[PDB]
Symmetry: C5
Subunit: 210 residues, 5 copies
């Protein structure tokens, strides 16, 4: 037990203190970031301001060579945990939020020996959404885009594993029931510039539960 | 006066020895799992909002664990058997409500108690908004709501989450609350995910309550 | 320039050259004296049974490690320090419903006898049923204050008086105060022989006419 | 010019010991004035009123003096308010923490004078009864040091007229008058005077 | 091999600019700084006629250039730009002059630095400011204005400019409660009777009404 602890501390020291740390992606060395949503609750829909409040888990995954190790050199440790503040994390942002996002989970990432990092902040988000039709069978439809704030598609290649939002943990007694929820990778161009810009469009269709 | 300076010097030396001169706990591993014992003392149901299905609780969340790296012999430190430390200066478990709707608001100073056997006691008072349908709260049968607590990033092979009792402590519940408590339980649950052989642990806090009359 | 240099030297001597107070122990208990000056009952919410008070919380304690001879420091008898740079007691409301909001600069007064005076102005929401507030008899509410992590053998919590100071109470508040008391209470827990101390603030109030 | 500015700041902040605050032997004059921008809200259910104002604070320190000839003719600079001593001037009857609206930056001039002007939103205790009438409502709030007497911080004003020249013309509330009056008080315990500036605002619903 | 090399060069560059060099201490009269400012208005969220406050969501584009942030890409593996936390560089103290609550930041506080020493910083923000929404429920709509400028620097220290006087409405939320009739951003030069120096602000004027 002392041995496994000593190995973990040595590993973390080797990656965080003895090695220079990831400065972020470049055009020459682009980073793939995979993004997916698990929608937990539509808490509130405000038709006086056209803001809707969601609670979701935002799953982020990327992989770095600088975070790789051989478990045989570190007492068979295959993974560890680190504060999200102590590693580089992608600047993925909602583009149409109306209040700062509120974080609901401890800011801790999972690092595996292949260099892959898994970071899953639970969040409450207020975003721009007209809930007209929410009190009808057809329901309301709203959308919000997520993407890097400062990196193009040539620097952060943003991807999804599926276009289906995970609804398996959606709160069964929410005020709003979900008719559908999709997450679609979109490529966008700006007329100034040849590089592509990537976002993931979260489209949610919902109505008042009855 | 002389003894008093001595006891102070010993406390400072102890804290220095544990926090500055020793490497500090990096968290649990599969080879070295940590038992964390969890219990709730429910103080008040402040608010039940049927327009959003959120309920607000005030409770004390008792957390206890034990580390070898925090052990000392009181005889080597002027018979000091315990001390206090800021929660920011030690490792603490990442226990989280799984269905909160707003960041938890902390109501107490973030200070932990460390004893010479290496056991740590940390008891944040908290206000929590969580997902809850209060339908039936204005009836005799009352409303029932539930919220799970557990580690965000550690399985049952890394943090073994336990309770001392399945009864929520109601002995400090606010007697003039808007809501009276019919029952409150805290149940350790073990769960498996089909991807993975390891067990995942949570503590399910189930509260049954109604408007006071 | 002489008086400034002496103040800086004094603060350097107490804060930088000396090891600082690690907190009280069973062998070296600390007396903390507590008193309230109630300024306003801002709000009483009968839909949630929360009441909001604005008060000044007077805290006083004394440390040997903060003593000095004024003759060795140009006749300086007192100074000011940020509350973050000294130890302060962890006195807490036991039945608050929101984090306390601080209204005053977090500065303490240190006198040459080693006594420290710290008086945060605060807004507090706490658990309170305001039923009867719209009547002659009024509503009664209570909230306890005490250390979060220290027993009576470590922090001996005291009051100078059991009367809450109402001499600054806001004369055009929505609520008038019928009475306000602050009572030291001693409590035992069945696990443990040590006493636990709190100060119970009891306020009786009604809607003004 | 940039090298000289950096050298000056280094000389004042890093190479010199910094101002520990005023003493009885070395009292500090702090001059205070208000520019009232808006009465945002008047809440008669809680008797709280919300103001937006600029709070002008000025003082002078020998330890912040320099000769511009020794620093490439630099006569002034800017510094974060966190990197210098600032006075603990406080509203005595606020009901919520003050919200700061401007960057916390002070202006330091070569004579050692410091100018610090935080824009603030303040909720304070105020009965707005009469606000819906011609006579209007009257409210008051005192400002002063929290921990220094008049023998340590000598609090002054330049004028007793609140500056209303930037008052928001389409506010919900119009200002009938606004004054800022230095008051001296004695407490029976103590011989030292205690100073505050009483901000009295008379206002009514527009128009 | 190249990938390790490009990473090493980025780290060396950042170390050279942030650790081995002193920070820009801010502008002076002898060395004034041009700051270019522009707005992209995303939403009028709320108009409160009981307090005369309006809430906007916008992106505030800020650009300036510093010699101390220049480098030759040939000396750093052809790196032409990088990203940095806004806390690690000097940023201009541009402020709304008639806000009623602290601005709420909606984007990560990261700036873009290019090898010519130019810095681009674009905080997304929610702002409450003083605004009478009377006429918002009519065809002519309501008109409100808010000035932006340096809090502590004159026109001889920060020369505040715009690239256009048209607010960018191309991302305005199509299902907002309020539709925008017009939105302009006008550089103004102000003289104060105390002082010969000019004071510069950018006046954001928005005309809007309830969507029908
Ligand atoms: C819903 C609309 C949005 C609009 C913004 C968008 O961004 C800008 C300028 C941007 C467009 C794309 C090309 C360019 C040119 C250089 C560069 O500068 C930005 C970062 C990346 C970089 C260095 O390549 C600089 C930067 C920090 C951008 C932050 C804002 C955005 N970031 C993500 C992504 C990069 C944009 C596409 C979309 C955008 C957020 C959503 O990108 O500039 C500015 C704002 C005001 C809007 O009008 C648009 O136009
Ligand atoms: C109410 C539903 C909840 C669902 C989440 C749950 O967690 C995930 C993936 C997770 C399931 C269990 C197996 C696995 C595989 C590796 C690992 O990764 C997470 C940390 C622990 C580790 C290393 O063993 C990585 C991590 C940071 C998990 C955060 C989320 C959760 N954490 C606590 C606990 C670990 C889960 C059971 C429950 C869960 C919070 C409540 O766990 O992955 C993701 C989210 C989106 C949900 O769909 C589920 O599925
Ligand atoms: C209105 C009811 C309240 C109940 C709490 C109370 O505290 C606990 C356990 C506590 C009772 C007294 C004996 C003991 C044993 C060791 C010790 O542990 C606490 C700190 C002091 C120490 C080391 O002596 C550990 C600690 C950090 C206590 C924080 C909580 C409280 N602190 C102040 C004071 C110390 C208690 C009396 C009262 C209490 C806040 C008010 O105290 O344990 C836990 C909570 C959940 C409640 O059920 C009770 O019981
Ligand atoms: C509207 C009523 C207010 C009442 C307070 C006032 O302050 C106290 C005690 C105070 C009265 C004046 C004399 C004395 C004696 C020593 C000293 O202690 C304070 C700081 C200055 C010092 C060292 O000279 C210690 C300190 C930190 C005081 C903070 C509170 C105030 N500060 C500013 C100014 C100093 C006071 C006049 C007014 C007061 C804020 C407004 O001042 O003590 C306590 C509180 C509870 C009230 O009842 C009164 O009485
Ligand atoms: C909508 C009205 C506003 C009014 C303010 C304005 O500023 C003051 C004094 C100011 C006017 C211009 C000349 C002068 C003289 C020296 C100097 O002092 C300020 C910083 C710049 C400096 C050193 O040149 C000192 C400082 C920190 C100013 C902060 C306030 C403002 N700053 C930006 C800009 C500098 C002003 C024009 C406008 C102003 C914010 C908007 O500027 O003083 C004070 C306040 C109370 C108002 O009455 C006016 O008058
Ligand atoms: Cl990293
Ligand atoms: Cl630890
Ligand atoms: Cl101390
Ligand atoms: Cl810089």
């Amino acid at each position: 037990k002392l041995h496994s602890q000593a190995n973990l501390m040595r590993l973390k020291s080797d990656l965080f203190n003895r090695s220079p740390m990831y400065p972020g992606p470049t055009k020459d060395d682009p980073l793939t970031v995979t993004l997916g949503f698990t929608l937990q609750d539509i808490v509130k829909a405000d038709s006086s301001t056209n803001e809707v409040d969601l609670v979701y888990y935002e799953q982020q995954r990327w992989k770095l060579n600088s975070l790789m190790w051989d478990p045989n050199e570190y007492g068979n440790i295959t993974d560890f945990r680190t504060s999200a503040a102590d590693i580089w994390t992608p600047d993925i942002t909602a583009y149409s939020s109306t209040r700062p996002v509120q974080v609901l989970s401890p800011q801790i990432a999972v690092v595996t020996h292949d260099g892959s990092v898994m970071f899953i902040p639970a969040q409450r988000l207020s975003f721009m959404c007209d809930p007209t039709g929410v009190d009808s069978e057809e329901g309301a439809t709203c959308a919000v885009k997520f993407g890097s704030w400062v990196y193009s598609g040539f620097e952060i290649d943003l991807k999804t594993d599926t276009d289906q939002v995970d609804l398996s943990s959606y709160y069964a007694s929410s005020k709003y029931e979900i008719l559908s929820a999709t997450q679609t990778r979109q490529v966008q161009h700006y007329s100034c510039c040849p590089e592509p810009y990537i976002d993931v469009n979260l489209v949610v269709k919902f109505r008042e539960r009855r």
